[PDB]
Symmetry: C3
Subunit: 164 residues, 3 copies
């Protein structure tokens, strides 16, 4: 004979809807209630569907922000920590390393600090200024020879080559 | 009585296929047309299925390249920007920092530039060369004393300790 | 007339279960056997479901560790390589750059090494120590003038300003 779907007395509501349906798309529309999941199964997702599916797939919020390609400075700090273990390198990646990080980063690459040349002292190597010009001596008496020696001494004193 | 599936006159084509099906796998084969989605639901995905599902799940192409573990230099630039906000650090991560980035990176870690010791001038602290040997004086007349003074002067001039 | 589901003689086992089912949730429970996939479709995933879905979606183990927000040092090395192409920068990100990496990292940012001021030599610019104090000369004879010259010479010798 011929019966119809509604003649089947113990069929369920969804069961009768499925029996009447003609295509797979129609069946998916009955079976899948979550609109984001339905969109994935249909291979047709909006950016909103994608974000919502990412919420169903991943627990970590910093990972989720990365996957959305939109990260805050806090998300970036956490993501840096997933990528790099060295604390001083993490300081560098923040753009704001601590004093300790800075020292350790220089050590890490063998870099020095800005060097400033200190003046010579009696205990410590240093720079000097060059002494003023001094004429060779043509002295024929003691008085003049002493005058010329003293001119050299003052020049060396003036340039901080010898102490006062 | 006994009826068969095709006796149900208002059943749909997919509906009759489902009513005849014996297992859940058979039902999934009817209902899910997208082969990548079907593969996910079956828990059996090839690398191609995985790439195609990633295309359905994520909009950002640089994120997608990261998830495929294959990034171009352009993808890497964009991913760096998702991970780090400091412009000078981004310059470092590129391997090709600008002049401004280089200055700022040194500031950031308190590093100096390569130092070259300049010669002393009359205005500016600097290095000198060490003067040649000079004998102590045993002069008993003015002529010799002057000779010995002049020997010291020339030595200091030769080493650039005093000006010509 | 009235028939029941079990009167349909060529219905399949899953087909009869679906025909009896009343709701979409009930239909999903019949059709989807993989518990992680069912959880995604129901929009209700535990952390275990999420990890298991990530296993179905991504092939690369280092990417998977990143997505779980739990990376080993080995995972971090591999993820760094997906993010940065410059070998010397990768050395920095490891926290343990090689000697070659260190040289190249300094070059990259225009940094110098720690500078140590060398003593002056007869060939090479260097620092000096400042000479001890020397009194101006009040000599009225050759013997004293020579004494004063020699005092200057010794002071300059003592400070390594001139050679012995």
């Amino acid at each position: 004979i011929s019966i119809e779907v509604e003649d089947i007395k113990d069929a369920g509501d969804t069961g009768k809807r499925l029996l009447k349906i003609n295509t797979p798309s129609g069946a998916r529309n009955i079976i899948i209630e979550n609109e984001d999941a339905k969109a994935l199964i249909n291979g047709e997702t909006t950016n909103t569907n994608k974000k919502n599916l990412q919420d169903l797939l991943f627990s970590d919020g910093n990972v989720k922000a990365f996957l959305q390609a939109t990260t805050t400075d806090e998300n970036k700090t956490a993501l840096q920590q997933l990528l790099v273990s060295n604390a001083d390198v993490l300081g560098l990646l923040s753009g704001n390393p601590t004093s300790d990080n800075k020292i350790n980063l220089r050590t890490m690459i063998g870099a020095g600090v800005p060097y400033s040349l200190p003046a010579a002292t009696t205990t410590t190597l240093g720079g000097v200024k060059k002494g003023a010009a001094v004429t060779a001596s043509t002295a024929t008496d003691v008085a003049t020879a002493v005058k010329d020696l003293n001119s050299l001494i003052t020049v060396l004193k003036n340039a901080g080559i010898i102490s006062l």
